[PDB]
Amino acid sequence: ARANWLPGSDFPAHLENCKLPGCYGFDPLGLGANEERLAWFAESERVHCRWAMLGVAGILVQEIVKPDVFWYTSGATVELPFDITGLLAFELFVMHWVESRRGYDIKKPGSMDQDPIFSNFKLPAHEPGYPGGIFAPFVPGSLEELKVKEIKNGRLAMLAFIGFTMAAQVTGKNPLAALREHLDNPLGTTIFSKAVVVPGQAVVPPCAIPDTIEFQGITIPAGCFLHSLWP
Amino acid sequence: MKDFTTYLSTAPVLTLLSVTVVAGLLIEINRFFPDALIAAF
Amino acid sequence: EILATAGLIPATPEEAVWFRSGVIPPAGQYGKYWMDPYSLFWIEAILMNFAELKRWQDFKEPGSQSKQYFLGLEAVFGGSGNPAYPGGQWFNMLNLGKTPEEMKKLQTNEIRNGRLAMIACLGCAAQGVMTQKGPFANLLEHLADPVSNNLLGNLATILK
Amino acid sequence: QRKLWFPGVAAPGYLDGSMAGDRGFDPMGLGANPKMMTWYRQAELQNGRWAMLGVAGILGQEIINPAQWWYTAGMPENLPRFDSQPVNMGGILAWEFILMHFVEVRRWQDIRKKDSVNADPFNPNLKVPNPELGYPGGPFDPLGFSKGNFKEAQTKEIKNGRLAMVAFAAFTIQAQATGKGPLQNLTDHLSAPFSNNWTTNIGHCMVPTSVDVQGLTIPLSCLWPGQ
Amino acid sequence: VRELWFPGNKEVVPDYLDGSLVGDHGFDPLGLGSSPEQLSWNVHAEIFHGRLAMTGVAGILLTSLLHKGGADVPEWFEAGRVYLDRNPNVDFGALLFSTIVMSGFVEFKRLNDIRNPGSQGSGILPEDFKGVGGPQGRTVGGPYVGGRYFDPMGLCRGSPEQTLKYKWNEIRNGRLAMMAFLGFAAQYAATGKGPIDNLVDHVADPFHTTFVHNGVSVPFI
Amino acid sequence: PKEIPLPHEFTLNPELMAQLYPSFSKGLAPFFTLDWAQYSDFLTFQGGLNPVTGGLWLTDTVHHHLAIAVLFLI
Ligand code: CLA
Ligand code: CLA
Numbered sequence: 004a005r006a007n008w009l010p011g012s013d014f015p016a017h018l019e020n021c022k023l024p025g026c027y028g029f030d031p032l033g034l035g036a037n038e039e040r041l042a043w044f045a046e047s048e049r050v051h052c053r054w055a056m057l058g059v060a061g062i063l064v065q066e067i068v069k070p071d072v073f074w075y076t077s078g079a080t081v082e083l084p085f086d087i088t089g090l091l092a093f094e095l096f097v098m099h100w101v102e103s104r105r106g107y108d109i110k111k112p113g114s115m116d117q118d119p120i121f122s123n124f125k126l127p128a129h130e131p132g133y134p135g136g137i138f139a140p141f142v143p144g145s146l147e148e149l150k151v152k153e154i155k156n157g158r159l160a161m162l163a164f165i166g167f168t169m170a171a172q173v174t175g176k177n178p179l180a181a182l183r184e185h186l187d188n189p190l191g192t193t194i195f196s197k198a199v200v201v202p203g204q205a206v207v208p209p210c211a212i213p214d215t216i217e218f219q220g221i222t223i224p225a226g227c228f229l230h231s232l233w234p
Numbered sequence: 235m236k237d238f239t240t241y242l243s244t245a246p247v248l249t250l251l252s253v254t255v256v257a258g259l260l261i262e263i264n265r266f267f268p269d270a271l272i273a274a275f
Numbered sequence: 276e277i278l279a280t281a282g283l284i285p286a287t288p289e290e291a292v293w294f295r296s297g298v299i300p301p302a303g304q305y306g307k308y309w310m311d312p313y314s315l316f317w318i319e320a321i322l323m324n325f326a327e328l329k330r331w332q333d334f335k336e337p338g339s340q341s342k343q344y345f346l347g348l349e350a351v352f353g354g355s356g357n358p359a360y361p362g363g364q365w366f367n368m369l370n371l372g373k374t375p376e377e378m379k380k381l382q383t384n385e386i387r388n389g390r391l392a393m394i395a396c397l398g399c400a401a402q403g404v405m406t407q408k409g410p411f412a413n414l415l416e417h418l419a420d421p422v423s424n425n426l427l428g429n430l431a432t433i434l435k
Numbered sequence: 436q437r438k439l440w441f442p443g444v445a446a447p448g449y450l451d452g453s454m455a456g457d458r459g460f461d462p463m464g465l466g467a468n469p470k471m472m473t474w475y476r477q478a479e480l481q482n483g484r485w486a487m488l489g490v491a492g493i494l495g496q497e498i499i500n501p502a503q504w505w506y507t508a509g510m511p512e513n514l515p516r517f518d519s520q521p522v523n524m525g526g527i528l529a530w531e532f533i534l535m536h537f538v539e540v541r542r543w544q545d546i547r548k549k550d551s552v553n554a555d556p557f558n559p560n561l562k563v564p565n566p567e568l569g570y571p572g573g574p575f576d577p578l579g580f581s582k583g584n585f586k587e588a589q590t591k592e593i594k595n596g597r598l599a600m601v602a603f604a605a606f607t608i609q610a611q612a613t614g615k616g617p618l619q620n621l622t623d624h625l626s627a628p629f630s631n632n633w634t635t636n637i638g639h640c641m642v643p644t645s646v647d648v649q650g651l652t653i654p655l656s657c658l659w660p661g662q
Numbered sequence: 663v664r665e666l667w668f669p670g671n672k673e674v675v676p677d678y679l680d681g682s683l684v685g686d687h688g689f690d691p692l693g694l695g696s697s698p699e700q701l702s703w704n705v706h707a708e709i710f711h712g713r714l715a716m717t718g719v720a721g722i723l724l725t726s727l728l729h730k731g732g733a734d735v736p737e738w739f740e741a742g743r744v745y746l747d748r749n750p751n752v753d754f755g756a757l758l759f760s761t762i763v764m765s766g767f768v769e770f771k772r773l774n775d776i777r778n779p780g781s782q783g784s785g786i787l788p789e790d791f792k793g794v795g796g797p798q799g800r801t802v803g804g805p806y807v808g809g810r811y812f813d814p815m816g817l818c819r820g821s822p823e824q825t826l827k828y829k830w831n832e833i834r835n836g837r838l839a840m841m842a843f844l845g846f847a848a849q850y851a852a853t854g855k856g857p858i859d860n861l862v863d864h865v866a867d868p869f870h871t872t873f874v875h876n877g878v879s880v881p882f883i
Numbered sequence: 884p885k886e887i888p889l890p891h892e893f894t895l896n897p898e899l900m901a902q903l904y905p906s907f908s909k910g911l912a913p914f915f916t917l918d919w920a921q922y923s924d925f926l927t928f929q930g931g932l933n934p935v936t937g938g939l940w941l942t943d944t945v946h947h948h949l950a951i952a953v954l955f956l957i
């Protein structure tokens with residue numbers, strides 16, 4: 004019928020006639036069966052989409068302008084202009100402020116659209132999770148299909164970031180470097196080529212990121228997610 | 235198991251289990267604290 | 276034993292004797308099985324436990340064992356009125372004894388053949404203790420010289 | 436119905452001869468549940484057609500490339516090379532895994548609901564006309580050999596599929612027992628049938644105890660314990 | 663009615679193990695939960711045993727997988743001495759008493775829920791710790807605790823058949839994990855190696871590596 | 884007692900028994916032919932005590948048990 008995550012199948016119960024953008028009748032485990040839980044999961048999905056979009060775009064642009072640096076270790080070897088403890092504290096304070104405001108918007112919409120400084124500036128009434136106003140200056144057409152575009156690009160970017168970190172853990176190099184490693188040898192650079200388990204032998208690709216990395220005196224156990232369960 | 239527990243609550247079963255647990259407690263007391271002639275604190 | 280005597284199987288006829296097949300390790304062992312006899316007995320115990328317990332519950336309730344799911348195999352476990360004669364789609368797959376008198380005649384055939392086989396199994400055990408050789412070998416030796424090779428003529432050498 | 440698998444067998448009630456291949460079998464009673472019965476007919480169709488493809492492949496490979504045994508034809512060193520790309524068995528397994536996963540999920544969704552995934556995923560204007568389950572047609576029937584008499588052709592397909600299943604079981608057992616090809620085994624039986632039969636040939640597993648495939652060890656087996 | 667632990671056979675215990683409890687297949691040959699109060703107590707014990715054994719078996723499996731991967735992770739049967747050797751500043755009595763006290767707090771919370779199903783959803787705890795009931799027909803307390811804290815994803819609020827399916831999942835997985843821990847203990851006793859070690863030893867060599875070849879189960883082979 | 888053969892292998896074959904009691908070389912043949920006097924090595928009747936142990940002769944106990952078993956079955 005309509006657009007579905009599995010053509011020919013039907014929507015569940017909680018997803019019948021979705022108001023959320025990018026609804027394709029998924030949720031096999033029924034995580035969104037509850038009402039307010041579905042709204043909380045929608046907000047978490049939207050911020051996950053946007054954060055992963057930012058992350059994938061940042062990794063790609065950092066590699067285009069600087070191919071010699073490795074994004075997985077970029078947090079330890081980048082030469083910060085400022086000290087890291089004060090930087091982390093500044094981020095914690097300001098992001099605590101903004102995320103508390105966003106979360107309390109999700110708890111109740113008409114509660115904090117107002118500038119705490121200036122009484123004249125205030126966001127207009129909006130659907131939860133879509134602030135707009137100052138946050139949305141320029142809109143290319145109607146809002147609904149562009150929201151669908153945003154959410155679909157966000158799903159793609161979350162999958163992209165997971166692929167990025169797995170390429171970094173398996174190959175030890177950049178995901179565009181991993182791309183150019185896969186194109187010249189398509190039959191051999193696949194994970195099926197380098198990782199086969201059979202009842203009698205298990206072949207696991209070696210981990211490239213060092214288990215312990217030293218950073219300003221201390222050591223961080225940034226190993227390789229977890230081994231053992233690797234195919 | 236109401237009737238079984240009532241049988242376990244009967245006087246001979248309860249007195250045998252009680253003297254068993256009391257004797258075992260005293261025996262393990264003498265096992266870990268032997269030759270206690272006096273109550274020296 | 277009749278296959279080893281003909282040479283069709285690559286088993287020595289002294290080894291192809293039934294009690295030397297690993298049923299009694301003191302009486303003889305066959306170490307070429309794909310597992311040791313204890314593992315085979317473990318899985319045999321599980322499988323016989325399945326089969327004989329379902330058979331027992333069908334004996335106790337002569338309508339059960341078809342109401343509970345068994346990977347679709349419960350359809351042939353209805354049985355009949357007689358516990359000894361289920362005869363469903365599996366137990367009577369070829370459908371023989373269509374008419375009751377033929378069924379009774381074939382039942383008599385089965386019971387007579389089986390009681391003859393009970394006598395034969397007891398005899399095979401007694402010959403195995405008596406002669407330390409296979410039943411087919413005992414038959415061949417008796418047919419060679421019946422006067423000398425009998426129960427009274429083998430009464431001296433019995434476990435040697 | 437008419438003639439059954441045995442001269443005296445009573446047909447099951449659910450085996451009324453309505454659909455293709457009915458010879459009054461099922462001694463297990465696996466066909467009592469109609470839902471599981473349709474599932475098992477789907478499994479029979481898939482297994483029969485795959486057995487046809489496998490048996491035809493073995494026969495054609497033996498008559499065209501007799502120097503290569505079909506049992507060991509999956510080895511990387513026996514794989515014929517068509518280009519300069521290195522051979523990697525995970526590379527082939529990725530292509531087949533993805534493609535067969537797609538097509539088998541499509542077939543599974545068709546099995547779950549009759550008339551479910553008939554339309555093209557891009558343009559939903561032209562579809563496949565399946566008359567019943569397991570029989571898609573359309574592009575799968577481009578030469579138009581159905582349409583007219585469909586029941587006898589269906590029984591032809593299912594009986595040839597059963598024959599191909601039995602033939603592939605024969606091929607596997609013969610390959611494990613004799614270590615040679617099937618048509619070569621038939622030729623050997625024409626020469627010395629009194630020594631090249633299932634006697635003596637059985638009880639020996641000509642399969643090696645293992646195999647190494649570019650550093651990967653596969654333990655292998657030969658269906659029955661006999662060496 | 664329902665699928666029993668022994669197909670056919672209608673001597674299944676009288677109508678206290680009717681087809682109402684989750685996981686009910688009529689299995690009580692010894693009558694250890696015949697009285698209704700003991701039945702409710704044993705339902706609490708079974709759910710708690712299933713959840714605890716599931717957590718323990720998952721931990722054992724993960725630590726055994728990590729041990730085969732070369733990580734600095736001990737096996738489950740020796741993790742206590744390994745922890746004491748790696749951390750000599752911890753007193754054994756200290757850690758044991760701390761475990762007793764912290765476990766006792768939440769276990770007395772659960773106990774006073776068992777005594778009174780509605781008494782733990784007030785006072786210091788919020789209304790989410792009231793419980794949702796389930797067994798024996800009650801709609802409060804019991805082994806199943808709803809709320810946004812013990813069901814933060816809310817997978818049994820809404821769609822009752824989803825709740826029933828998930829409860830059946832939980833009880834079947836809990837019984838399976840209890841038998842799994844029993845197997846872990848027996849395999850450690852009879853072999854001296856870990857569970858994953860035993861599994862990959864049997865997968866590598868299907869034959870000559872069964873339970874009869876360890877010399878403990880069969881005590882002469 | 885460590886190097887003494889186990890009871891079953893004494894029971895298993897009449898060879899070791901014939902080494903210890905020579906009447907087992909002929910087996911059950913003198914029993915069914917009623918030449919029971921050849922079983923006199925292990926079916927004895929001396930009386931008194933075994934001087935090694937001070938107990939009764941075990942062959943005498945065997946003969947006793949066989950005789951009373953026949954009497955009781957009668
Ligand atoms: C953590 C990120 C996240 C979150 C919060 C959501 C949340 C939501 N998604 Mg979404 N989704 C995501 C990621 C996420 N998604 C990604 C990456 C993809 C691409 C594969 C999709 C593709 C997708 C589709 C096609 C649809 C949804 C839909 C929905 C909504 C209903 C489903 C539901 O109620 O369950 C809530 C889901 C969660 C609470 C996430 C739980 C995460 C678990 C606990 C971790 C397990 C990870 C799992 C094993 C995968 C490993 C990650 C990686 C290896 C791939 C819901 C608000 C449906 C909808 O109606 O749209 C509005 C729908 O049609 N999602
Ligand atoms: C010669 C011995 C003998 C005889 C005369 C019978 C006779 C009978 N059996 Mg019985 N049975 C036997 C041995 C025998 N059985 C043994 C050894 C077992 C243990 C495995 C069984 C177990 C058994 C069960 C569980 C049942 C019967 C039933 C029956 C009755 C059904 C009618 C029938 O099909 O007859 C049998 C016909 C013959 C014996 C002649 C054919 C002999 C050929 C040479 C052997 C066929 C084997 C074949 C080569 C293997 C493949 C079979 C097929 C796929 C080709 C019938 C009266 C059923 C019943 O009671 O119906 C109500 C039923 O429930 N039998």
Ligand code: CLA
Pocket residue numbers: 440450454455456457458459460461463464465466467472475476477478479482597598600601604605
């Ligand atoms: C995997 C293959 C397969 C499958 C799924 C089916 C499925 C089905 N068959 Mg079919 N059949 C097959 C193979 C198969 N068959 C072969 C090879 C033959 C030729 C001997 C036949 C001959 C046949 C006839 C004559 C009839 C059926 C019928 C049926 C239908 C009802 C039977 C039933 O319910 O049991 C379901 C069956 C299964 C679930 C398969 C289980 C396989 C077991 C577990 C393995 C057994 C191993 C086997 C003995 C060894 C084979 C190798 C050997 C040759 C050396 C059903 C949908 C009836 C029908 O057409 O209905 C209308 C009927 O009349 N079949």
Ligand code: CLA
Pocket residue numbers: 667679683684685686687688689690693694695696701704705706707708711837838840841
């Ligand atoms: C200690 C864990 C535990 C507990 C408390 C329960 C409790 C309960 N079970 Mg359950 N069960 C368990 C484990 C447990 N089970 C496991 C591991 C399995 C999988 C094998 C099952 C499978 C099962 C089924 C299929 C069913 C039940 C059912 C029941 C309920 C009624 C039975 C009853 O009243 O007897 C009370 C039980 C006990 C008092 C515990 C028995 C412990 C004994 C006394 C020790 C000996 C057993 C031990 C295995 C022997 C080895 C010990 C040692 C040598 C290693 C009841 C609430 C029935 C039900 O209606 O579900 C609600 C039912 O259908 N159980």
Ligand SMILES: CC1=C[C@H](O)CC(C)(C)[C@H]1/C=C/C(C)=C/C=C/C(C)=C/C=C/C=C(C)/C=C/C=C(C)/C=C/C1=C(C)C[C@H](O)CC1(C)C
Pocket residue numbers: 029030031032033034050051052054055057058059061062065074077078161162164165
């Ligand atoms: C839907 C559902 C429902 C049902 O029922 C169930 C299930 C199935 C479970 C589900 C789910 C699924 C899934 C897939 C999920 C996932 C998610 C994700 C992936 C997220 C991520 C997400 C992700 C994310 C955020 C990410 C982010 C990232 C970032 C920011 C990055 C950053 C960075 C950069 C720039 C660069 C530098 O130098 C460094 C760093 C710092 C590194």
Ligand SMILES: CC1=C[C@H](O)CC(C)(C)[C@H]1/C=C/C(C)=C/C=C/C(C)=C/C=C/C=C(C)/C=C/C=C(C)/C=C/C1=C(C)C[C@H](O)CC1(C)C
Pocket residue numbers: 365366367368369370371388389391392394395396398399402409410411413414
């Ligand atoms: C059920 C059914 C139903 C469906 O539908 C159909 C069908 C399939 C037909 C079916 C089946 C059937 C069957 C299984 C049958 C079988 C039988 C048998 C095996 C018999 C034997 C049977 C067997 C028998 C009698 C045996 C006998 C034996 C004998 C006499 C022996 C003798 C002897 C001895 C003492 C020793 C010496 O030194 C030698 C000799 C001379 C050698």
Ligand SMILES: CC1=C[C@H](O)CC(C)(C)[C@H]1/C=C/C(C)=C/C=C/C(C)=C/C=C/C=C(C)/C=C/C=C(C)/C=C/C1=C(C)C[C@H](O)CC1(C)C
Pocket residue numbers: 460461462463464465481482483485486487488489490492493504505506508509600601603604
């Ligand atoms: C009917 C019934 C019913 C009742 O109720 C029960 C009973 C009695 C059980 C029954 C019976 C059944 C049966 C007989 C079954 C069988 C089946 C089969 C055999 C299958 C196969 C099936 C088979 C199949 C698929 C196969 C396929 C094959 C293939 C793909 C192959 C491929 C290939 C080739 C080309 C060559 C290369 O170089 C390699 C390879 C790779 C090797």
